[model samples]
Target: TSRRWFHPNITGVEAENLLLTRGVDGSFLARPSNPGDFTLSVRRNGAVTHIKIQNTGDYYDLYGGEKFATLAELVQYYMEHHGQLKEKNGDVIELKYPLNCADPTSERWFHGHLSGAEKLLTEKGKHGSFLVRDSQSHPGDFVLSVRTGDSKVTHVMIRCQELKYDVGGGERFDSLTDLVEHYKKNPMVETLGTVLQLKQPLNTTRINAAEIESRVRELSGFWEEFETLQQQECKLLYSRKEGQRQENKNKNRYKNILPFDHTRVVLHDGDPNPVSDYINANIIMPEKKSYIATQGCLQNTVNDFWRMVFQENSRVIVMTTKEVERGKSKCVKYWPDEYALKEYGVMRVRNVKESAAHDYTLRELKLSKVGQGNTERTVWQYHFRTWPDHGVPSDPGGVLDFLEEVHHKQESIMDAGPVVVHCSAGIGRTGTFIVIDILIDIIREKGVDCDIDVPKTIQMVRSQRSGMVQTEAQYRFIYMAVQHYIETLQRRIEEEQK
Candidate 1:
């Protein structure tokens, strides 16, 4: 049923022509080679290679190797075990990007592979919500799901004849998109003459993985949605009263950049005064994994900072800005020199090891409680020093690597608490780093093919802690970061094939 791989009536030459024109080095498709057998046409370098598939009743295989039940099974096996699929000279015939043989509409509205309609439109969309997809029964044809009202939906089949495009008995057009645009202007009519409306087209987040250039161009619309996120200060409710309390007067480095009391990370320990609990930090929990998004430790609040970290049982501290930048103080040096120790309130911190990276310093710190029944805990400080004070880093690779660099350390420790993330006020670079890390995690888990709503993600963090992902340039950089990660991911897979 899910056989988009096997092209029905395509010849070897036609397959080569198609693969050469529209595919990358590893792009491939399966087609019938003879009466009962099939062939896998894959692109490499600037040439196309046709590898014969033996489809002998019992099972299928590429002449030798392991046999498969069907074409899908064979292709999936080779794609998964990239090293196993070899040529006569033992060269790896990498099978990566799968090209659709007949479903060729490249519009964003086209939900090419597996997608949905009616109930989804009813639940998530308004009246006249729409999407274009391939007709289940007819592979060559197209269908548009037009929501007539909240309760009803109309699915009209779009016929394609060579280059001409039209819906059923309607007037034909050159492009499928052109035909849809006409429908957008003049709504279609159904069987019983109920005026079929097309108010909104639900665009697809799924893109052709081979096209990074198109992905970047498609994200050109980012600035508009980004500007909207910037202008929504009116709806920003919740109080910053905790930071404004008389007892907590001078604890903040930036008095204006206060933590929202709704998600404030309250310290639990000695001293019952209102001043004791304030650390100028917020509990920025994106989902379940919690992060103590805090300001750079002030000279007076360094004790409060350590108290907060120790009280919360945090293990990873991500410092996104330098202690001193351009002869100005961004963050106070909270830890001591290598192999040295220091005291902050009740928590004693010893800098165990400090290792240099391309753009950051990873320090291993041991914090031991100073009282009776004394116990110690290990923590790491990812002091990212490359980010400039004015804007984001010139390249996002270092930050991406820095994010993962913490993960390697984060996982090895048992029952680690919230990660302590800070940059000056904890809303600009701090937010940028966290947001990128979250999005990158989503892509890694779901897939690079999964949809990422950058603005909404920024808004999510901003709601927890005010002004997360501050500047417009920083906002733009978020998109670039995701794009850069995807590019590297694609490369990593292809390289693995080698």
Candidate 2:
């Protein structure tokens, strides 16, 4: 109908479009076409409208704008269809089924709310986001409503995947008497109702002491490693640049070059293939020294394994994994938050932007070298090289710069001794990084007395970390990188001579 009102940009369309358009900076929403020339209306489901056709052209436009039958049904569809939407920078937890598996005894199983983290029931924000545990045995319809602190009832999930229940506002019964009276004479039944009276098991304990102890020990071991790493710093080769601002001092709070009393050493037989003579354990600094400790990899020793190898009190813990990120995955699940990095120490990059140059150069070199006419037609161009399988290498700069800084930080700042390293399947990336780390020390830090064959060291490292230097390319890269570094050092020396 024709009515006098202002345009409030109710469509929320302009906001979405601006986000999609890259680098277009400014206020995106258009100004009101004319005051009181449009009939502004709020639809029941919250869509906005400007009904005056002549005054404001094309006032209503929104993608996928419609109301679903129920919140449960909506969540089911969202989870089923949009499983690909990962938060990237945030945490996400998903359950097995989107709805209705909580009550197995009843045919018409009802689910309701319990304590949950808040996001308002509706109106304030979008709803239907929650986490559920997968249970196949007795999937029922009584899920709890969870909220943060109090005052907000965040979610009321129905385990029944079929339910589409969404309640606006039902009666609130303050006490048992009020609830009983309403149940007897209530005129309107809520689509989703809250059961006022319910019973639960009394005198039950859920804490598992074994699990807690295991977690604490894991944390303690990592702390021990941080101590040792403090003592393991190699001297800087390029000389410290002046005015390297201390703004990010928090990143290096711990004292580096740890004393023996501060850290511990735990070793393990992280051999992937025991029968192969091509692989064996490596000791870069060998002795019957009390500082060096060892642990053997065995079944049911995940907790002990972590303490022995990765612990800060331990000088070094070596093991094999399927990937470099596996350590992260294990810590996220088994250990306390940030325990590994804090205690045992993990290698990471100091400067991301500076190292990006090599990455881009490598990418271009790989693309140029791949034989091609129609770049799209060749497998080398389209598939293998499309994402990562490029010939140049995946961010060697990222590995180098991070480890280089990490080595210093461990020795001088964090007081963690040396570094605990790993890679996919344990051997390949881990071995490559270790060799590079040692070789850097030998050439750049004046190590005439030390003796370590690069190829032999990697073969030994692989035995401990299971494919420490996995591929021929990776092994060859370490060799070439060392030679390249030595030549660069020689050139610098000659320039100084001149």
Top TM-score model:
1
Model 1: which residue pairs collide?
none
lDDT of 1: 0.73
Q: Worst lDDT window (10 residues) for model 2?
A: 377-386
The segments of candidate 2 whose C-alpha lies over 4 angstroms from its true place after superposition are 1-306, 309-395, 413-418, 447-452, 460-466, 494-498
Candidate 2: count the clashes: 71
Please, what are the lDDT tens digits per residue for candidate 1 over residues 116-135? 47666675567778878777
How much is 101 displaced in model 1, in angstroms? 50
Looking at model 1, residue 299 earns an lDDT score of 88
lDDT of 2 at 121: 28
Candidate with maximal lDDT? 1
